[PDB]
Design an enzyme around this catalytic site. Sequence first.
Site, PDB file in Angstrom:
ATOM      1  N   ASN B 190     -45.144  99.457 -56.047  1.00 24.49           N
ATOM      2  CA  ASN B 190     -43.687  99.609 -56.025  1.00 24.49           C
ATOM      3  C   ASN B 190     -43.090  99.534 -54.601  1.00 24.49           C
ATOM      4  O   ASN B 190     -41.900  99.803 -54.433  1.00 24.49           O
ATOM      5  CB  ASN B 190     -43.290 100.941 -56.671  1.00 24.49           C
ATOM      6  CG  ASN B 190     -43.637 101.045 -58.137  1.00 24.49           C
ATOM      7  OD1 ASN B 190     -43.990 102.110 -58.636  1.00 24.49           O
ATOM      8  ND2 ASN B 190     -43.520  99.969 -58.859  1.00 24.49           N
ATOM      9  N   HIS B 192     -43.725 101.577 -52.123  1.00 26.97           N
ATOM     10  CA  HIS B 192     -43.594 102.911 -51.548  1.00 26.97           C
ATOM     11  C   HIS B 192     -44.877 103.223 -50.759  1.00 26.97           C
ATOM     12  O   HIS B 192     -45.904 102.605 -51.014  1.00 26.97           O
ATOM     13  CB  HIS B 192     -43.361 103.957 -52.660  1.00 26.97           C
ATOM     14  CG  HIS B 192     -41.987 103.870 -53.269  1.00 26.97           C
ATOM     15  ND1 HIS B 192     -41.081 104.910 -53.161  1.00 26.97           N
ATOM     16  CD2 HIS B 192     -41.398 102.854 -53.944  1.00 26.97           C
ATOM     17  CE1 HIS B 192     -39.970 104.487 -53.749  1.00 26.97           C
ATOM     18  NE2 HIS B 192     -40.107 103.253 -54.223  1.00 26.97           N
ATOM     19  N   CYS B 227     -42.251 109.084 -46.989  1.00 27.76           N
ATOM     20  CA  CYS B 227     -42.131 108.396 -45.694  1.00 27.76           C
ATOM     21  C   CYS B 227     -41.727 106.971 -46.110  1.00 27.76           C
ATOM     22  O   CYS B 227     -42.304 106.419 -47.062  1.00 27.76           O
ATOM     23  CB  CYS B 227     -43.460 108.385 -44.948  1.00 27.76           C
ATOM     24  SG  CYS B 227     -43.529 107.196 -43.569  1.00 27.76           S
TER      25      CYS B 227
END
EC number: 3.1.2.14
Lengths: 269, 268
Positions: B190, B192, B227
């Site tokens: 995704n 991330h 993050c």
Amino acid sequence: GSLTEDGLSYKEKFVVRSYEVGSNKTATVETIANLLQEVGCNHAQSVGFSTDGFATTTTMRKLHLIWVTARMHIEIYKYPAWGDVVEIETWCQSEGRIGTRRDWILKDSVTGEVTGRATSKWVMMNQDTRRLQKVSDDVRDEYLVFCPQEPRLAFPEENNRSLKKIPKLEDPAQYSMIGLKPRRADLDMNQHVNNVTYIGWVLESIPQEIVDTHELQVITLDYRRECQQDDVVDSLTTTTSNDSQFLHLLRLSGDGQEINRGTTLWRKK
Amino acid sequence: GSLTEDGLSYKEKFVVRSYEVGSNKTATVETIANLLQEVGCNHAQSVGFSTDGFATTTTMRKLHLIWVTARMHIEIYKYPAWGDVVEIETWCQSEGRIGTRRDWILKDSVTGEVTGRATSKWVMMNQDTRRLQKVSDDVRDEYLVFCPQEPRLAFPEENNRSLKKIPKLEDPAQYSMIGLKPRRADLDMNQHVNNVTYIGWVLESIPQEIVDTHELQVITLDYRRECQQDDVVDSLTTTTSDSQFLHLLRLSGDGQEINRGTTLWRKK
Ligand SMILES: CC(C)c1nc([C@@H]2CCCN2)no1
């Protein structure tokens, strides 16, 4: 995995894992390079080799000699999807006194379709002085028995990409990613930086717009010097070109000493 | 891998790879965490959550929601050696409407000896706004039938390490690793930052003298904020003691907390 019927090549199947894939749910080129290294390691272990360097022979260990990668060239036609099974075949060929060459063929396990191929040039070095040398007859005789002796090339073509000379990128670079550092996960079992890390670092300086709209088709990388655990690296890229081509350079952020140079070829999705 | 006889848990065997091991030729804790994620994903698929999403349910896909780890607690007794086969069992369980868990038991495939155990808590995030939210009734209903109803805990002791509250590290830290940044290999499907990167970043600030002479026994990690791909992180550690440490991960710029945790190490 297992050696083939003639005992001169090794095959292994891998099921692509959830964390091994990128944004399009297909294996990244770093996953492919890790699977190449893995099938190569299992091939050497299957014919009796130890782990103090890659495929160190008895005479090599006596003379303090190791094999080191000089170049890696990978061509991918289709990246396998998450959950797919990829079959990889690998073999080594003696190239006389110059060194050795390890090749790989990647196939879709269901259809038998060739989905990629790779090659790598290896040279001999004294482990202590770091000085390269020709391969002696005694060393050659110890490993020739596990190699096909007739030519077997993953890249048989007359003037193919795998043997192209790579020039040095001139300052200033078009793109850059500065201050890259290895973490503990980037080291191998001997505490050296893993060769796949250098691939990730070369690709960090490719602009995101290219990564999002194109697929990596070919990567060629020359390895000049290893990055140590406490070194910091700068990744530099310049476009050289539907197809987009780039010239790459990795150097230590401190003194600017070259560690790697290479090229990549991308095709619009 | 396969679902078990009662269809309420999933098992999978893994052969430890050459690049998955550390200096003593045994799997690193990041390799263990990656195998945990993998058996978790195969379990989600074995019950109808397709590879068109990262373990996300039909309602999650409709509402643009993705899974977020809230906490992870791992206890390893023996790290499997290079070439060994480790068998991992996983299951999910709701704790009323307040908690959502995924537990694991790791075993030596030959002897059946339990070599480790792990637990995790989950929340959801809208993939576009990045706003966190607890698992909804509609989403929970989409997998309750695949969960054991009576409690089945990998850590059944009342007042065990997996549920301990983690304090915030006070400046100045005893040890630090500054300017850590994620590369493309550190991202999930995704886009991330993946779960093993935060684990690797917490451990970067442990002194080499400890890593070389001790083994990691327990790691507990609380996940406060993700993050982002263009963020820079500082990893801070302070000894609290076996050797015990308090950890904190924060953005290098503003000092915003992203993770806090503890580790417990045994001298080899
Ligand atoms: C396993 C056997 C075929 C072998 N391969 C090798 C070479 C060493 C550098 C690249 N591979 N030597 O023996």
